[PDB]
């Protein structure tokens, strides 16, 4: 059908871990869904020590925002590279077919913009990332990645084909950073991107992240920015990792239904404690909360979680179920 | 139903890789299944060189013992921290719902004990581990982890819904250790836990294990402690890894039915050569032996297996099947 | 049935990434399928810098060639170790049952040969590799591994049981090398295998590959050796990794049907962006091309892909579909 005959809808994105408005079950026929993102090179402080890096972002955040469409919609993205940036950038959608996911068509120097359209022919959560030829892992591991969710037109389904409807959704982007270290182990900083590049390559070639964070920094999804839920709410957590495997775990909960490799035509795995999201993938986990209190949500390499940054929190409201768990004898002498 | 009306049964645990007595198919209604574990901080020699570490254990072993219940039983654990220990400990069950898996309710100083109860609402094999706030990966990577199996009340089923009944079960706990090294590469020892802690953190932050072992030491599941089976026996191998991914493989065999991420509501994967158990998970593999002789059971990063310790053996009794395999021409000149 | 009554067919192998002739659906009853491989120790240049290693190969290549049979055929392999080699070698088939996959029966010194037969009782793609007791990871990580495909007798099937027929097949072997480095970071070379062995062990124990390549070298599956396809062709890519996990991704495409852990009795995963092939496994991905142009095929740890070597290309012929993807506004000022 002629694409100029289709409805157009403009999305206004939100910063992760929040997700822009959308309907689970498609309330219209196929649409051209219009998005705009502005690339921002910016300094970011990523840890409690004050370590500051030169991040490369879509729309000012690490991760980039979650885009949401339905299967067989068209995604039309206007990608802007303002002249205040210094580098060449582009975008590759793992949801898309052809031209390196769009990367071959979206190369923008500072001061340029472009508009890409693709048909979202496969349902699932997918990574998107910058990928300039010859500099790909540098851009991705500088934070230049996010995700897109392509919902089935009739929403999510369980392993038996019955509906799964979330009440809340969050997007956790997990980022491995490779901050270059001197021989004593202290981070180096650099005066220009070119002067940094060889030691970024050197740091990356060790394959050992210095930091692994959610939402761009140690502690970002804690305190006043903890995720929230109520007992009995159905929550979908989309989780991406553009470059290394991760093993998400909700401490005190489960993934009731998990698409570990993120593709909704497949039945979910049930009752997961932990699951493996391969580097280069988005996964999604659905959970109905049953207990109030604090939860941690981690990469279950616990060194990565608690020493390198890959941990966030939920604060859950509601009543405690002593049938599901109780302290019979509280800690006491002997 | 009122929990005080339920039967109580006391389990007496056994040391891994053996598993305490149980019935695959539940012979009673739901029960409160009572367990006791005593925490033991102890020196352990982990390799053939004599490297000795200060391990932190549940019940004196690495891994902690396998607990076995059925779905919708209640697990009631008395956790004892004797005054001969020096540290604070607790326990998080990945099988449980709420309070950080129990960790928020089970904090015991030396000289204290506690009793936790939870409902085992989801069937599968699950990790349990110590997780004291601010010291989590140190305790887990000191050996303070084990697993619990929550059987379906009607036992295990194959991908078609027919029964799978094991004749024997073993529990392989796989442990990544991070023994601190000086600049020359030799292990350091320490005089107190506090004096060790920073270099343990430093060692962990390299993300590179020094040792990866089954049942607490290089070679533990070999020789007089090799696993055993007979041709035609059905064996379930439960395998856990609380902190890093592993890729188990039976050299000379297969996983006929594998729950790689350990959750029995899902159909197993058939005919696996190797499978991925993510860090923070227990998996289970069912195999019917068809050939006698020696088998190795490994993490199939073969460096991890054969240089770092992640290898055990089966000794299998019975008759050789030349239809399945034979040497047509034995090795000879030309 | 008496094996001497069965047909014999001799296969003539081809060098990867190509695959010898075969029929998807079995056109005969069960056969003894005869293969010959000659071990070759040889120098190989593995990167653009000219780094040369002493590789250990089956049939002169890294990976060894793909062998193809059907379920319940017998594989009969004549393995030759010419006297021009210096080491002991053998072979373990993950497809086989008993005697360490054949390794216990196939130990050949230089100047010896042997013939092994096994029944291919399970359908899937499987690793094969050398595994001499006490030297296993050295041989495997020197390149001495390949794969075997055991097709179902009625060919491949989708998640619904309908046929999947490929038009083309390729075999990508992915190799992690551990070239020993001095303290300055430069590669060492060695005068004999014995003089190399300790530092190979030392290099392996770091767990950090120096190189991760497809088809034996950086860039091997590019340029005049890029993989090829046409729009509308159905392609199966078999991918093995004998020692470390990998996360394959077709840049600009998908895995339409993926057996990530390689075993065809299981339904494939649909619509994958990226998938996890555990170390010690072969996986297979089926894709129907929809767009022409250049694709990259990578391990989606992009550092591993673009800095360490784990990247190849497809060149795809045919017409561009602007409905699936188009540049609406090409990159331009503002
Ligand atoms: Cu960029
Ligand atoms: Cu990508
Ligand atoms: Cu502890
Ligand atoms: Cu845990
Ligand atoms: Cu060899
Ligand atoms: Cu193997």
mmCIF file of N, CA and C in Angstrom, chain C residues 228-328:
data_model
loop_
_atom_site.group_PDB
_atom_site.id
_atom_site.type_symbol
_atom_site.label_atom_id
_atom_site.label_comp_id
_atom_site.label_asym_id
_atom_site.label_seq_id
_atom_site.Cartn_x
_atom_site.Cartn_y
_atom_site.Cartn_z
ATOM 1 N N UNK C 228 28.594 -14.776 -0.302
ATOM 2 C CA UNK C 228 27.685 -14.184 -1.277
ATOM 3 C C UNK C 228 26.297 -14.785 -1.173
ATOM 4 N N UNK C 229 25.310 -14.007 -1.620
ATOM 5 C CA UNK C 229 23.937 -14.426 -1.740
ATOM 6 C C UNK C 229 23.230 -13.494 -2.677
ATOM 7 N N UNK C 230 22.023 -13.882 -3.024
ATOM 8 C CA UNK C 230 21.113 -13.074 -3.827
ATOM 9 C C UNK C 230 19.856 -12.800 -3.020
ATOM 10 N N UNK C 231 19.219 -11.683 -3.305
ATOM 11 C CA UNK C 231 17.907 -11.414 -2.715
ATOM 12 C C UNK C 231 16.959 -12.587 -2.997
ATOM 13 N N UNK C 232 16.257 -13.020 -1.946
ATOM 14 C CA UNK C 232 15.358 -14.106 -1.991
ATOM 15 C C UNK C 232 15.970 -15.467 -1.732
ATOM 16 N N UNK C 233 17.284 -15.576 -1.639
ATOM 17 C CA UNK C 233 17.908 -16.861 -1.285
ATOM 18 C C UNK C 233 17.850 -17.128 0.179
ATOM 19 N N UNK C 234 17.656 -18.414 0.501
ATOM 20 C CA UNK C 234 17.592 -18.955 1.862
ATOM 21 C C UNK C 234 18.998 -19.461 2.180
ATOM 22 N N UNK C 235 19.598 -18.930 3.233
ATOM 23 C CA UNK C 235 20.983 -19.259 3.583
ATOM 24 C C UNK C 235 21.035 -19.778 5.007
ATOM 25 N N UNK C 236 21.737 -20.897 5.181
ATOM 26 C CA UNK C 236 22.049 -21.399 6.512
ATOM 27 C C UNK C 236 23.491 -21.080 6.827
ATOM 28 N N UNK C 237 23.724 -20.437 7.953
ATOM 29 C CA UNK C 237 25.081 -20.171 8.446
ATOM 30 C C UNK C 237 25.289 -21.021 9.686
ATOM 31 N N UNK C 238 26.157 -22.010 9.596
ATOM 32 C CA UNK C 238 26.585 -22.834 10.741
ATOM 33 C C UNK C 238 27.759 -22.059 11.349
ATOM 34 N N UNK C 239 27.768 -21.935 12.665
ATOM 35 C CA UNK C 239 28.799 -21.138 13.337
ATOM 36 C C UNK C 239 29.236 -21.945 14.549
ATOM 37 N N UNK C 240 30.548 -22.167 14.681
ATOM 38 C CA UNK C 240 31.063 -22.911 15.844
ATOM 39 C C UNK C 240 32.055 -22.090 16.618
ATOM 40 N N UNK C 241 32.170 -22.433 17.900
ATOM 41 C CA UNK C 241 33.173 -21.841 18.789
ATOM 42 C C UNK C 241 33.488 -22.902 19.792
ATOM 43 N N UNK C 242 34.690 -23.535 19.715
ATOM 44 C CA UNK C 242 35.023 -24.678 20.538
ATOM 45 C C UNK C 242 35.416 -24.322 21.971
ATOM 46 N N UNK C 243 35.652 -23.053 22.270
ATOM 47 C CA UNK C 243 36.264 -22.684 23.559
ATOM 48 C C UNK C 243 35.701 -21.489 24.270
ATOM 49 N N UNK C 244 35.021 -20.566 23.567
ATOM 50 C CA UNK C 244 34.426 -19.387 24.225
ATOM 51 C C UNK C 244 33.089 -19.064 23.590
ATOM 52 N N UNK C 245 32.264 -18.430 24.396
ATOM 53 C CA UNK C 245 30.927 -17.993 23.912
ATOM 54 C C UNK C 245 31.121 -17.004 22.746
ATOM 55 N N UNK C 246 30.159 -16.989 21.876
ATOM 56 C CA UNK C 246 30.063 -15.960 20.859
ATOM 57 C C UNK C 246 28.600 -15.549 20.707
ATOM 58 N N UNK C 247 28.394 -14.419 20.050
ATOM 59 C CA UNK C 247 27.066 -13.769 19.936
ATOM 60 C C UNK C 247 26.925 -13.274 18.526
ATOM 61 N N UNK C 248 26.623 -14.167 17.575
ATOM 62 C CA UNK C 248 26.580 -13.784 16.167
ATOM 63 C C UNK C 248 25.424 -12.836 15.836
ATOM 64 N N UNK C 249 25.675 -12.013 14.827
ATOM 65 C CA UNK C 249 24.737 -10.973 14.365
ATOM 66 C C UNK C 249 25.031 -10.702 12.936
ATOM 67 N N UNK C 250 23.986 -10.677 12.113
ATOM 68 C CA UNK C 250 24.053 -10.288 10.685
ATOM 69 C C UNK C 250 23.663 -8.820 10.609
ATOM 70 N N UNK C 251 24.629 -7.940 10.337
ATOM 71 C CA UNK C 251 24.373 -6.487 10.354
ATOM 72 C C UNK C 251 23.558 -6.123 9.100
ATOM 73 N N UNK C 252 22.341 -5.643 9.338
ATOM 74 C CA UNK C 252 21.352 -5.393 8.269
ATOM 75 C C UNK C 252 20.375 -6.510 8.079
ATOM 76 N N UNK C 253 20.536 -7.640 8.787
ATOM 77 C CA UNK C 253 19.600 -8.754 8.696
ATOM 78 C C UNK C 253 19.274 -9.285 10.064
ATOM 79 N N UNK C 254 18.875 -10.569 10.107
ATOM 80 C CA UNK C 254 18.390 -11.276 11.276
ATOM 81 C C UNK C 254 18.740 -12.731 11.132
ATOM 82 N N UNK C 255 18.550 -13.500 12.190
ATOM 83 C CA UNK C 255 18.385 -14.952 12.088
ATOM 84 C C UNK C 255 16.916 -15.217 12.089
ATOM 85 N N UNK C 256 16.336 -15.531 10.919
ATOM 86 C CA UNK C 256 14.883 -15.799 10.860
ATOM 87 C C UNK C 256 14.497 -17.009 11.690
ATOM 88 N N UNK C 257 15.313 -18.063 11.665
ATOM 89 C CA UNK C 257 15.147 -19.259 12.448
ATOM 90 C C UNK C 257 16.536 -19.601 12.970
ATOM 91 N N UNK C 258 16.716 -19.691 14.275
ATOM 92 C CA UNK C 258 18.010 -19.930 14.836
ATOM 93 C C UNK C 258 17.947 -21.071 15.843
ATOM 94 N N UNK C 259 18.839 -22.031 15.695
ATOM 95 C CA UNK C 259 19.113 -23.071 16.686
ATOM 96 C C UNK C 259 20.375 -22.602 17.346
ATOM 97 N N UNK C 260 20.273 -21.776 18.371
ATOM 98 C CA UNK C 260 21.459 -21.137 18.942
ATOM 99 C C UNK C 260 22.450 -22.153 19.531
ATOM 100 N N UNK C 261 21.926 -23.206 20.149
ATOM 101 C CA UNK C 261 22.733 -24.282 20.687
ATOM 102 C C UNK C 261 22.720 -25.509 19.768
ATOM 103 N N UNK C 262 22.176 -25.349 18.551
ATOM 104 C CA UNK C 262 22.500 -26.197 17.376
ATOM 105 C C UNK C 262 21.765 -27.499 17.211
ATOM 106 N N UNK C 263 20.693 -27.806 17.957
ATOM 107 C CA UNK C 263 20.140 -29.161 17.959
ATOM 108 C C UNK C 263 18.742 -29.209 17.399
ATOM 109 N N UNK C 264 18.576 -29.877 16.249
ATOM 110 C CA UNK C 264 17.432 -29.694 15.366
ATOM 111 C C UNK C 264 16.133 -30.331 15.882
ATOM 112 N N UNK C 265 16.165 -31.179 16.905
ATOM 113 C CA UNK C 265 14.912 -31.695 17.502
ATOM 114 C C UNK C 265 14.172 -30.574 18.203
ATOM 115 N N UNK C 266 14.837 -29.455 18.514
ATOM 116 C CA UNK C 266 14.205 -28.337 19.172
ATOM 117 C C UNK C 266 13.658 -27.369 18.173
ATOM 118 N N UNK C 267 12.558 -26.701 18.491
ATOM 119 C CA UNK C 267 12.066 -25.645 17.599
ATOM 120 C C UNK C 267 13.107 -24.518 17.588
ATOM 121 N N UNK C 268 13.316 -23.890 16.442
ATOM 122 C CA UNK C 268 14.212 -22.730 16.396
ATOM 123 C C UNK C 268 13.598 -21.514 17.064
ATOM 124 N N UNK C 269 14.444 -20.619 17.514
ATOM 125 C CA UNK C 269 14.074 -19.263 17.883
ATOM 126 C C UNK C 269 13.878 -18.382 16.668
ATOM 127 N N UNK C 270 12.815 -17.630 16.649
ATOM 128 C CA UNK C 270 12.469 -16.823 15.493
ATOM 129 C C UNK C 270 12.936 -15.373 15.651
ATOM 130 N N UNK C 271 13.290 -14.776 14.521
ATOM 131 C CA UNK C 271 13.464 -13.339 14.398
ATOM 132 C C UNK C 271 14.615 -12.763 15.217
ATOM 133 N N UNK C 272 15.626 -13.595 15.475
ATOM 134 C CA UNK C 272 16.690 -13.145 16.342
ATOM 135 C C UNK C 272 17.493 -12.001 15.738
ATOM 136 N N UNK C 273 17.845 -11.030 16.579
ATOM 137 C CA UNK C 273 18.855 -10.024 16.190
ATOM 138 C C UNK C 273 20.265 -10.629 16.373
ATOM 139 N N UNK C 274 20.463 -11.250 17.545
ATOM 140 C CA UNK C 274 21.711 -11.773 18.024
ATOM 141 C C UNK C 274 21.364 -12.973 18.869
ATOM 142 N N UNK C 275 22.275 -13.943 18.944
ATOM 143 C CA UNK C 275 22.065 -15.165 19.703
ATOM 144 C C UNK C 275 23.338 -15.607 20.387
ATOM 145 N N UNK C 276 23.229 -16.453 21.393
ATOM 146 C CA UNK C 276 24.410 -16.851 22.174
ATOM 147 C C UNK C 276 24.742 -18.325 21.836
ATOM 148 N N UNK C 277 25.880 -18.554 21.198
ATOM 149 C CA UNK C 277 26.458 -19.844 20.967
ATOM 150 C C UNK C 277 27.465 -20.093 22.071
ATOM 151 N N UNK C 278 27.222 -20.981 23.002
ATOM 152 C CA UNK C 278 28.197 -21.151 24.106
ATOM 153 C C UNK C 278 29.500 -21.749 23.602
ATOM 154 N N UNK C 279 30.621 -21.396 24.232
ATOM 155 C CA UNK C 279 31.863 -22.102 23.959
ATOM 156 C C UNK C 279 31.688 -23.580 24.120
ATOM 157 N N UNK C 280 32.202 -24.333 23.137
ATOM 158 C CA UNK C 280 31.948 -25.783 23.042
ATOM 159 C C UNK C 280 30.727 -26.195 22.270
ATOM 160 N N UNK C 281 30.209 -25.314 21.420
ATOM 161 C CA UNK C 281 28.972 -25.594 20.712
ATOM 162 C C UNK C 281 29.045 -25.091 19.260
ATOM 163 N N UNK C 282 28.221 -25.705 18.418
ATOM 164 C CA UNK C 282 27.883 -25.152 17.100
ATOM 165 C C UNK C 282 26.418 -24.776 17.137
ATOM 166 N N UNK C 283 26.117 -23.637 16.496
ATOM 167 C CA UNK C 283 24.785 -23.177 16.279
ATOM 168 C C UNK C 283 24.526 -23.001 14.799
ATOM 169 N N UNK C 284 23.267 -22.793 14.444
ATOM 170 C CA UNK C 284 22.905 -22.588 13.027
ATOM 171 C C UNK C 284 21.787 -21.589 12.912
ATOM 172 N N UNK C 285 21.887 -20.703 11.938
ATOM 173 C CA UNK C 285 20.908 -19.634 11.668
ATOM 174 C C UNK C 285 20.515 -19.665 10.232
ATOM 175 N N UNK C 286 19.220 -19.598 9.995
ATOM 176 C CA UNK C 286 18.623 -19.584 8.654
ATOM 177 C C UNK C 286 18.041 -18.186 8.379
ATOM 178 N N UNK C 287 18.372 -17.607 7.227
ATOM 179 C CA UNK C 287 17.902 -16.283 6.865
ATOM 180 C C UNK C 287 17.561 -16.245 5.398
ATOM 181 N N UNK C 288 16.496 -15.592 5.036
ATOM 182 C CA UNK C 288 16.167 -15.309 3.644
ATOM 183 C C UNK C 288 16.501 -13.844 3.380
ATOM 184 N N UNK C 289 17.446 -13.599 2.484
ATOM 185 C CA UNK C 289 17.829 -12.236 2.189
ATOM 186 C C UNK C 289 16.725 -11.474 1.516
ATOM 187 N N UNK C 290 16.535 -10.226 1.907
ATOM 188 C CA UNK C 290 15.495 -9.313 1.385
ATOM 189 C C UNK C 290 15.995 -8.048 0.758
ATOM 190 N N UNK C 291 17.265 -7.739 0.957
ATOM 191 C CA UNK C 291 17.927 -6.529 0.452
ATOM 192 C C UNK C 291 19.291 -6.846 -0.093
ATOM 193 N N UNK C 292 19.680 -6.196 -1.171
ATOM 194 C CA UNK C 292 21.041 -6.339 -1.697
ATOM 195 C C UNK C 292 22.034 -5.457 -0.952
ATOM 196 N N UNK C 293 23.297 -5.586 -1.265
ATOM 197 C CA UNK C 293 24.359 -4.773 -0.730
ATOM 198 C C UNK C 293 25.284 -5.565 0.154
ATOM 199 N N UNK C 294 26.111 -4.817 0.848
ATOM 200 C CA UNK C 294 27.062 -5.385 1.772
ATOM 201 C C UNK C 294 26.446 -5.544 3.152
ATOM 202 N N UNK C 295 26.689 -6.683 3.732
ATOM 203 C CA UNK C 295 26.365 -6.991 5.127
ATOM 204 C C UNK C 295 27.638 -7.325 5.845
ATOM 205 N N UNK C 296 27.716 -7.049 7.116
ATOM 206 C CA UNK C 296 28.773 -7.633 7.924
ATOM 207 C C UNK C 296 28.088 -8.709 8.771
ATOM 208 N N UNK C 297 28.856 -9.692 9.145
ATOM 209 C CA UNK C 297 28.451 -10.825 10.007
ATOM 210 C C UNK C 297 29.500 -10.837 11.091
ATOM 211 N N UNK C 298 29.092 -10.642 12.331
ATOM 212 C CA UNK C 298 30.030 -10.362 13.419
ATOM 213 C C UNK C 298 29.701 -11.138 14.668
ATOM 214 N N UNK C 299 30.706 -11.310 15.533
ATOM 215 C CA UNK C 299 30.485 -11.474 16.996
ATOM 216 C C UNK C 299 30.130 -10.081 17.544
ATOM 217 N N UNK C 300 28.966 -9.951 18.166
ATOM 218 C CA UNK C 300 28.479 -8.644 18.595
ATOM 219 C C UNK C 300 29.004 -8.216 19.975
ATOM 220 N N UNK C 301 30.144 -8.762 20.438
ATOM 221 C CA UNK C 301 31.055 -7.880 21.205
ATOM 222 C C UNK C 301 31.819 -7.171 20.122
ATOM 223 N N UNK C 302 31.450 -5.958 19.854
ATOM 224 C CA UNK C 302 31.980 -5.199 18.726
ATOM 225 C C UNK C 302 33.450 -4.920 18.858
ATOM 226 N N UNK C 303 34.007 -4.960 20.068
ATOM 227 C CA UNK C 303 35.461 -4.893 20.203
ATOM 228 C C UNK C 303 36.065 -6.165 19.611
ATOM 229 N N UNK C 304 35.491 -7.314 19.969
ATOM 230 C CA UNK C 304 35.920 -8.554 19.388
ATOM 231 C C UNK C 304 35.776 -8.598 17.888
ATOM 232 N N UNK C 305 34.697 -8.056 17.389
ATOM 233 C CA UNK C 305 34.494 -7.962 15.928
ATOM 234 C C UNK C 305 35.489 -7.109 15.234
ATOM 235 N N UNK C 306 35.548 -5.850 15.641
ATOM 236 C CA UNK C 306 36.242 -4.830 14.814
ATOM 237 C C UNK C 306 37.628 -4.530 15.283
ATOM 238 N N UNK C 307 38.025 -4.892 16.493
ATOM 239 C CA UNK C 307 39.405 -4.736 16.893
ATOM 240 C C UNK C 307 40.153 -6.043 16.913
ATOM 241 N N UNK C 308 39.515 -7.175 17.253
ATOM 242 C CA UNK C 308 40.189 -8.456 17.374
ATOM 243 C C UNK C 308 40.003 -9.434 16.214
ATOM 244 N N UNK C 309 39.104 -9.153 15.284
ATOM 245 C CA UNK C 309 39.006 -9.906 14.060
ATOM 246 C C UNK C 309 37.699 -10.631 13.742
ATOM 247 N N UNK C 310 36.698 -10.592 14.607
ATOM 248 C CA UNK C 310 35.515 -11.506 14.488
ATOM 249 C C UNK C 310 34.434 -10.875 13.604
ATOM 250 N N UNK C 311 34.772 -10.602 12.355
ATOM 251 C CA UNK C 311 33.899 -9.953 11.395
ATOM 252 C C UNK C 311 34.182 -10.475 9.999
ATOM 253 N N UNK C 312 33.124 -10.817 9.281
ATOM 254 C CA UNK C 312 33.146 -11.142 7.846
ATOM 255 C C UNK C 312 32.076 -10.373 7.131
ATOM 256 N N UNK C 313 32.013 -10.536 5.811
ATOM 257 C CA UNK C 313 31.067 -9.801 4.985
ATOM 258 C C UNK C 313 30.289 -10.749 4.112
ATOM 259 N N UNK C 314 29.039 -10.369 3.808
ATOM 260 C CA UNK C 314 28.287 -10.881 2.633
ATOM 261 C C UNK C 314 28.215 -9.752 1.629
ATOM 262 N N UNK C 315 28.256 -10.157 0.374
ATOM 263 C CA UNK C 315 27.924 -9.300 -0.795
ATOM 264 C C UNK C 315 26.664 -9.905 -1.394
ATOM 265 N N UNK C 316 25.565 -9.152 -1.407
ATOM 266 C CA UNK C 316 24.280 -9.676 -1.827
ATOM 267 C C UNK C 316 23.832 -8.941 -3.083
ATOM 268 N N UNK C 317 23.437 -9.682 -4.105
ATOM 269 C CA UNK C 317 22.989 -9.182 -5.379
ATOM 270 C C UNK C 317 21.485 -9.108 -5.446
ATOM 271 N N UNK C 318 20.969 -8.108 -6.144
ATOM 272 C CA UNK C 318 19.576 -8.022 -6.441
ATOM 273 C C UNK C 318 19.022 -6.633 -6.306
ATOM 274 N N UNK C 319 17.692 -6.522 -6.263
ATOM 275 C CA UNK C 319 17.057 -5.185 -6.293
ATOM 276 C C UNK C 319 16.709 -4.712 -4.909
ATOM 277 N N UNK C 320 16.852 -3.422 -4.729
ATOM 278 C CA UNK C 320 16.616 -2.721 -3.467
ATOM 279 C C UNK C 320 15.111 -2.518 -3.271
ATOM 280 N N UNK C 321 14.632 -2.775 -2.036
ATOM 281 C CA UNK C 321 13.227 -2.624 -1.656
ATOM 282 C C UNK C 321 13.088 -1.367 -0.810
ATOM 283 N N UNK C 322 12.541 -0.319 -1.432
ATOM 284 C CA UNK C 322 12.365 0.950 -0.722
ATOM 285 C C UNK C 322 11.211 0.919 0.261
ATOM 286 N N UNK C 323 10.313 -0.030 0.158
ATOM 287 C CA UNK C 323 9.282 -0.196 1.166
ATOM 288 C C UNK C 323 9.902 -0.655 2.494
ATOM 289 N N UNK C 324 10.868 -1.571 2.428
ATOM 290 C CA UNK C 324 11.524 -2.094 3.666
ATOM 291 C C UNK C 324 12.444 -1.064 4.266
ATOM 292 N N UNK C 325 13.134 -0.276 3.432
ATOM 293 C CA UNK C 325 14.049 0.759 3.945
ATOM 294 C C UNK C 325 14.299 1.771 2.869
ATOM 295 N N UNK C 326 14.285 3.043 3.223
ATOM 296 C CA UNK C 326 14.733 4.064 2.286
ATOM 297 C C UNK C 326 15.266 5.267 3.033
ATOM 298 N N UNK C 327 16.149 5.977 2.378
ATOM 299 C CA UNK C 327 16.574 7.314 2.827
ATOM 300 C C UNK C 327 15.556 8.295 2.327
ATOM 301 N N UNK C 328 14.791 8.862 3.238
ATOM 302 C CA UNK C 328 13.811 9.888 2.898
ATOM 303 C C UNK C 328 14.497 11.218 2.546
#
